[PDB]
Design a binder for this molecule. Structure first.
Ligand code: ASP
Lengths: 142, 143
């Protein structure tokens, strides 16, 4: 709007948007899957459905919020360094989304053994690179 | 002077960011215990091994540690209305979390699953977001 940081809060602290909704979809999936183990009988097994559909929407919302950080970068400068931040986004997005198919489908054993914490971890690392090399940097250089 | 203040706000928004994010990590390792505690209605044993409950214990304590840094930074006066709010909203969202650590610690599956933790959580989000919005609206150095 005004220069950087006006366009950077709405941009990387709007990037903080995607990371909470992707983690949210993680909590919502393992509330869904625990109830799927209840299914052999009913007493509250019932919420499962609702949490899976509404797991799918937080990973949606993440996507769209990501779509502004994309449709907001005409930027680079930090360029291919934080291009990794943009690629591993896609990597976790993809994990979580398979975790929906799997669950959605009935495949619990890959649900449980698909190593989600790692695609996650990478993106922690990746946005966690960006803010460093935004913060100490466009100050030292502009 | 000038600078002083613009730099408390980033340490304070970072201590608050780390509390939130880390209290969220707690949610997910706790779920992962719960989830691996329901196994075939009642499986015989394990499911898997749930260290993950100890993991949730790690992450609660280290959420609560960046919030105890946050509570020892010099209070800007303007702000105090958002912080009172935040601390309410944080203390309760921490009790909520030790309570779920406990219901799991002692195998009370039906009471874990029963607690509205998403509600106390949501309460905190709208609080951190309102401190962050008030901050802009008060000290946004535009230009
Ligand atoms: N109290 C838990 C319920 C569940 O595990 O589904 C939550 O809201 O976090």
């Amino acid at each position: 709007g005004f220069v950087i940081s006006n366009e950077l809060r709405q941009q990387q602290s709007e990037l903080t948007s995607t990371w909470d909704l992707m983690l949210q979809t993680r909590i919502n999936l393992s509330r869904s899957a625990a109830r799927m183990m209840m299914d052999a009988s009913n007493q509250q097994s019932s919420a499962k459905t609702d949490l899976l559909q509404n797991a799918k929407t937080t990973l949606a919302q993440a996507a769209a919020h990501y779509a502004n950080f994309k449709n907001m970068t005409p930027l680079p400068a930090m360029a291919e360094a934080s291009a990794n931040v943009d690629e591993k986004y896609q990597r976790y997005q993809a994990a979580l989304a398979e975790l929906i198919q799997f669950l959605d489908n009935g495949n619990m054993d890959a649900y449980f053994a698909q190593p989600t914490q790692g695609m996650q971890n990478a993106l922690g690392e990746a946005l966690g690179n960006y803010a460093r090399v935004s913060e100490n940097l466009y100050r030292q250089t502009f």
